[PDB]
Design a protein around this nucleic acid. Structure first.
Ligand SMILES: [K+]
Ligand SMILES: [Mg+2]
Ligand SMILES: [Mg+2]
Ligand SMILES: [Mg+2]
Ligand SMILES: [Mg+2]
Ligand SMILES: [Mg+2]
Ligand SMILES: [Mg+2]
Ligand SMILES: [Mg+2]
Ligand SMILES: [Zn+2]
Lengths: 132, 102, 337, 223
RNA sequence: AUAUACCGCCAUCUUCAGCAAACCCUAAAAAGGUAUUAAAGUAAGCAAAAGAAUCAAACAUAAAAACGUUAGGUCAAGGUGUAGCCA
C-alpha cells in the first residue's frame, strides 16, 4: 500500500482540507502547485537553489505565525520578486499581524537579497473540504 | 446560638432544603452493612476518613434548642428517632442526638 | 541542522506510537508545548513594541528593549508556576458517585438523554445503568470482535420511566444508544398519593418472580437494589418487594415495568364496580375516608362478601403472621433508601 | 380575536353531528354496495366475531347495523380532523384499487400511499423525509392487510407514533389496533368505491365548513 | 542497543471486494433485519466504478486499489521514545 502524502481514513470525524484530501497522483489534475517558479522548465537553471529557498520559507512562516496558518502557503516568484500567499486564522490581534508582516518581509529581503512581499488572507476558521 | 446556622445562607447553599445526611454514604465491605456505625468520628482532635453528617460539618451543633436540626433526625410520619445506620451518624453523635431530642 | 527539524504534530505521532503493530493486537501521554507561549516572548527577554508589549504607553511611542536579568528570572519562574498549576489542574478531577459497588456500572447515573429533533430537552430526566456486559464476538475483521451491551433505565421521578438496551463496539456508544432509545419507551406508572403503588402486585416474568407490597409513608424502599434504582426514577418512595427465581436483570426490569404499568387505580375500581372506594387507616380510627367515587351512576347492590375468601395465599407472606422465625438477614438496619 | 379562534375550534365539538355525516350513508346504501359480505368461515379472525351477523352457508355475514354505528363515528372523527386542517393519509396495498385510492386522495386534497411501505417511514421519518417533516395526523386504512395476508406495517407503526387510525376491517382482519374500525367488505369494487366516496365527501364538507366558519367569524371582527 | 516503542516511506495478498459510522425495528436482541405482482429497514462515507493521463476517437497501457493479514522491510535517508558512551 502507498503511504505517501495520503491522509488516511479515520471514522468520518477527521476534517481534511482540499489540499490534504487529494493524493499525489491528483497533482496537475485536481490540485495545482503550491510554488510557481521557472526553475524546473526545460533548459532552465537553478532548480536546486529555488527549491532550497522554498523549504526554508515554509519553515520560517510556520514559526513566525505559530498556530495561525489555516493552510499551506503559496510561493510565487516573478523576476526577482518573491510573493508569499498564506491563509491565516483570525486568532491574533490585527496590529500584531502588521508587525509580523513588516518583520518577516524585511528579514527575508535582506536574507535572500530580493524584494519579498507577504499576502495574508484571513479566514474565520479552517475550511473543511470533506470529513473522512 | 446554634439555631442561627440552619437559617444562614451558608447552610442553604451547602444543604438546600434536604436533610444534612442526604448526601452521605458509608464505606464498607459487602452489600449488607454492619449493624452499628463507627463509635466516633473524632478522636483527640483527629477526624476519621469519611466523617459522618454531623461530624463533617463543625458548625452543626447537637443542642436541644436547635430543633430544626433535630427534626431532620426524627420521622415526620411515625415520630420515631432513626437508628444510626439510617442516617450514618456515628454512635457518639447518635446518643447525643437522642438525648437532645428527648 | 535547521533542515532536519520536524513539526510538533509529527514529533508526537512518532513518540506516542499509538498507531503500531503492538498497539492494535497488544504510558506515554501527549502534551502541548505552545500552550503558554505568547508570541514575542523569548529566553533573552527582549521587548517588542506591538508584539509582546504595548505599542504606545502613556502617549509615548515605545522602542525596542530588553528585560534585566532579575526581571527575566521572575518571568521565567512565573511561567514555571503556571505550568505546574496547569499540571495540577490536569491532576485535579471531579469524582462521580459509585453505584452498587465501586468497580461496577450498575446504579451509575450517566446524565439526561440528548435533546430531541426540535430542541426537546430532557433535563428533568435522569439515566441509570443496570447491567453492562462486555462480550467478544466472532467476525472476520479481527477474528474476534468486541461488543458492549448496556441496559439502562430513565425516569423523571414523577411517574414517567422507561428502559432500553443499547449495543455497540465502544461502551460510550452503547450508553448513548440505550439512553436515547429508552426516552422513546416511557411508561407512566400510577402512584397512590404520589409515594407508593396502588395495591400489592405479584407476577412471574419468565423465571423471575416479583412480589411487591403497598406500604405506608416512611417505610422506604426495601427492595432489590435494581428495584430501588428504578423506583427512584419512577418516584415511588415507600414499597417492599421480593425477587425469587432467576435474577436476570432484563427479566427483572421487564417484569417490573409490566406489573407497575398494569396496576388498577382506586378510581378505576370505583368505575368498574360502580361502588364507593373507602379507606380505613388505623391512625385515623373508624373514620371512613372516601378515596374514589364512581364517575357515573352509584350502584345500590352491595358487593358480595363471602364468609371465607378463596384467595390464593403465599406461604412467604403468611409464614410471618404464623409466628415462624425469620432469617437472621431479615429486617436488618440499613441506610436510608 | 381570541374568542373568534376559540369559536372556530371549540364550537364544533359541542354538537353530536356538526357536519351531518349521518345523511351520507344508510344501511340500505351499504347493503347495495355489498358491504356485508365477508370471507369464508375458515378465514375468520377471532377479534371480528363481535361484528359478524352470522354464517350464511360458509360465508360470514357482517352486521350492517354495527357498521352504521361504527362508520358514523369514523366519519365524524375524520371530519373534525379535516376541519382542523390535519393531514390525512390513505393507505392500502390492494393493487386493484391502487389508482382509485390515489385519485380519491387527490380529489379530497389529502395524501395516499398505495405503494410498498418502507421500513421506518413513520418511526424514522426524519431520516427519510427531512429534519422537520410533519407526520400524518390521521391514517385511513381502506385495507389493513398487505399482499402476504399480514397486517400492514403502518398499523403497528401508527400506534407507535400515537397516530389514530380509521380502518376498514373485514372478517379476516385484526381490528385491535385500529382506533375507529369500520366492519365491512374490502374486496368488492362496489364496497371500496362507496367508502372512497364517503371519505371524500366527508373531507370536502369539513374543509368547506371551516372556510365558511372563518369568513363569518372574521367578518364579525370588523362588523 | 531495541524495526517487538514509532513517524516517515514501502512490500504481500491486490485491480482481491470489501471496511467503518449514524439512525430505525423485534412478545428480547446469545442476534437479526430479504422478498420488486415486494413482507422492516433507511440514509450518508472510504474503496471499486466514473473521471483525468499517454495532446482526435476508441481499445489498450499506465495510474489507482480501502480496512485488515505478515509484531513483513527499513533505528544506516532523515526524525524520534526508552536504555547506553562522554580522555
Ligand atoms: K513501520
Ligand atoms: Mg473499591
Ligand atoms: Mg377482504
Ligand atoms: Mg515491522
Ligand atoms: Mg532485520
Ligand atoms: Mg481518459
Ligand atoms: Mg478507477
Ligand atoms: Mg520483524
Ligand atoms: Zn461522627
Amino acid at each position: 500500500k502507498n503511504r505517501a502524502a495520503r491522509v488516511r481514513v479515520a471514522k468520518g470525524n477527521k476534517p481534511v482540507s482540499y489540499e490534504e484530501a487529494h493524493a499525489p497522483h491528483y497533482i496537475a489534475h485536481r490540485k495545482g502547485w503550491l510554488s510557481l517558479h521557472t526553475g524546473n522548465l526545460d533548459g532552465e537553471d537553478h532548480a536546486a537553489e529555488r527549491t532550497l529557498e522554498d523549504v526554508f520559507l515554509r519553515k520560517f512562516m510556520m514559526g513566525t505565525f505559530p498556530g495561525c496558518l489555516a493552510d499551506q502557503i503559496v510561493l510565487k516568484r516573478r523576476a526577482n520578486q518573491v510573493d508569499i500567499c498564506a491563509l491565516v486564522l483570525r486568532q491574533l490581534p490585527a496590529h500584531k499581524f502588521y508587525f509580523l508582516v513588516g518583520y518577516s518581509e524585511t528579514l527575508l529581503s535582506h536574507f535572500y537579497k530580493c524584494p519579498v512581499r507577504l499576502h495574508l488572507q484571513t479566514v474565520p476558521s479552517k475550511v473543511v473540504y470533506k470529513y473522512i | 446560638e446554634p439555631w442561627k446556622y440552619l437559617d444562614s445562607e451558608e447552610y442553604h447553599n451547602r444543604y438546600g432544603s434536604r436533610p444534612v445526611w442526604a448526601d452521605y454514604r458509608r464505606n464498607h465491605k459487602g452489600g449488607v452493612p454492619p449493624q452499628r456505625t463507627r463509635k466516633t468520628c473524632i478522636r483527640n482532635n483527629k477526624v476519621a476518613g469519611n466523617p459522618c453528617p454531623i461530624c463533617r460539618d463543625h458548625k452543626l451543633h447537637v443542642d436541644f434548642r436547635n430543633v430544626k436540626l433535630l427534626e431532620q433526625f426524627v420521622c415526620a410520619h411515625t415520630g420515631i428517632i432513626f437508628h444510626a445506620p439510617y442516617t450514618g451518624v456515628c454512635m457518639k453523635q447518635h446518643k447525643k442526638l437522642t438525648q437532645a431530642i428527648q | 541542522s535547521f533542515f532536519t527539524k520536524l513539526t510538533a504534530e509529527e514529533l508526537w505521532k512518532g513518540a506516542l506510537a499509538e498507531t503500531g503493530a503492538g498497539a492494535r493486537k497488544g504510558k506515554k501521554k501527549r502534551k502541548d508545548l505552545n500552550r503558554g507561549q505568547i508570541i514575542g516572548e523569548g529566553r533573552s527577554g527582549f521587548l517588542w513594541p506591538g508584539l509582546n508589549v504595548p505599542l504606545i504607553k502613556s502617549g509615548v511611542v515605545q522602542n525596542i528593549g530588553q528585560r534585566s536579568k532579575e526581571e527575566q528570572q521572575k518571568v521565567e519562574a512565573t511561567m514555571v508556576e503556571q505550568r505546574e498549576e496547569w499540571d495540577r489542574k490536569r491532576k485535579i478531577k471531579v469524582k462521580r458517585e459509585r453505584g452498587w459497588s465501586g468497580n461496577t456500572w450498575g446504579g451509575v447515573s450517566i446524565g439526561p438523554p440528548d435533546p430531541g429533533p426540535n430542541g426537546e430537552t430532557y433535563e428533568d430526566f435522569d439515566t441509570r445503568i443496570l447491567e453492562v456486559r462486555n462480550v467478544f464476538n466472532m467476525t472476520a475483521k479481527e477474528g474476534r470482535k468486541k461488543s458492549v451491551r448496556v441496559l439502562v433505565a430513565v425516569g423523571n421521578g414523577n411517574g414517567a420511566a422507561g428502559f432500553a438496551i443499547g449495543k455497540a463496539a465502544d461502551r460510550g456508544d452503547a450508553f448513548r444508544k440505550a439512553k436515547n432509545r429508552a426516552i422513546h419507551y416511557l411508561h407512566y406508572i400510577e402512584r397512590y398519593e404520589g409515594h407508593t403503588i396502588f395495591h400489592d402486585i405479584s407476577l412471574r416474568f419468565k423465571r423471575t418472580q416479583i412480589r411487591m407490597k403497598k406500604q405506608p409513608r416512611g417505610y422506604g424502599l426495601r427492595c432489590h437494589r435494581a428495584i430501588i434504582t428504578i423506583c427512584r426514577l419512577i418516584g415511588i418512595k415507600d414499597m417492599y418487594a421480593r425477587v425469587t427465581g432467576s435474577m436476570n436483570m432484563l427479566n427483572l426490569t421487564r417484569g417490573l415495568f409490566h406489573g407497575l404499568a398494569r396496576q388498577e387505580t382506586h378510581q378505576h375500581l370505583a368505575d368498574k364496580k360502580g361502588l364507593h372506594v373507602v379507606e380505613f387507616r388505623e391512625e385515623c380510627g373508624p373514620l371512613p375516608i372516601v378515596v374514589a367515587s364512581p364517575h357515573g351512576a352509584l350502584s345500590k347492590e352491595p358487593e358480595p362478601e363471602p364468609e371465607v375468601p378463596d384467595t390464593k395465599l403465599d406461604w412467604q407472606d403468611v409464614k410471618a403472621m404464623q409466628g415462624l422465625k425469620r432469617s437472621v438477614w431479615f429486617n436488618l438496619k440499613r441506610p436510608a433508601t | 380575536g381570541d374568542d373568534f379562534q376559540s369559536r372556530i375550534l371549540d364550537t364544533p365539538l359541542q354538537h353530536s353531528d356538526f357536519f351531518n355525516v349521518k345523511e351520507l350513508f344508510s344501511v340500505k346504501s351499504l347493503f347495495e354496495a355489498r358491504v356485508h359480505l365477508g370471507h369464508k368461515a375458515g378465514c375468520r379472525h377471532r377479534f371480528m366475531e363481535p361484528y359478524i351477523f352470522g354464517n350464511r352457508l360458509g360465508q360470514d355475514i357482517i352486521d350492517l347495523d354495527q357498521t352504521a354505528l361504527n362508520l358514523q363515528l369514523a366519519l365524524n372523527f375524520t371530519a373534525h380532523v379535516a376541519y382542523r386542517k390535519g393531514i390525512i393519509l390513505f393507505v392500502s396495498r390492494n393493487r386493484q384499487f391502487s389508482h382509485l385510492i390515489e385519485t380519491t386522495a387527490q380529489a379530497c386534497g389529502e395524501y395516499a400511499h398505495t405503494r410498498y411501505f418502507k421500513g421506518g417511514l413513520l418511526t424514522n421519518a426524519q431520516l427519510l423525509f427531512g429534519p422537520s417533516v410533519r407526520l400524518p395526523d390521521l391514517i385511513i386504512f381502506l385495507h389493513t392487510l398487505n399482499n402476504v395476508f399480514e397486517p400492514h406495517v403502518a398499523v403497528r407503526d401508527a400506534a407507535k407514533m400515537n397516530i389514530p387510525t380509521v380502518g376498514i376491517v373485514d372478517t379476516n382482519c385484526n381490528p385491535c389496533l385500529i382506533t375507529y374500525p369500520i366492519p365491512g367488505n374490502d374486496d368488492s369494487p362496489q364496497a371500496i368505491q362507496l367508502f372512497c366516496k364517503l371519505f371524500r365527501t366527508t373531507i370536502n364538507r369539513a374543509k368547506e365548513k371551516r372556510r365558511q366558519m372563518e369568513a363569518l367569524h372574521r367578518l364579525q371582527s370588523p362588523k
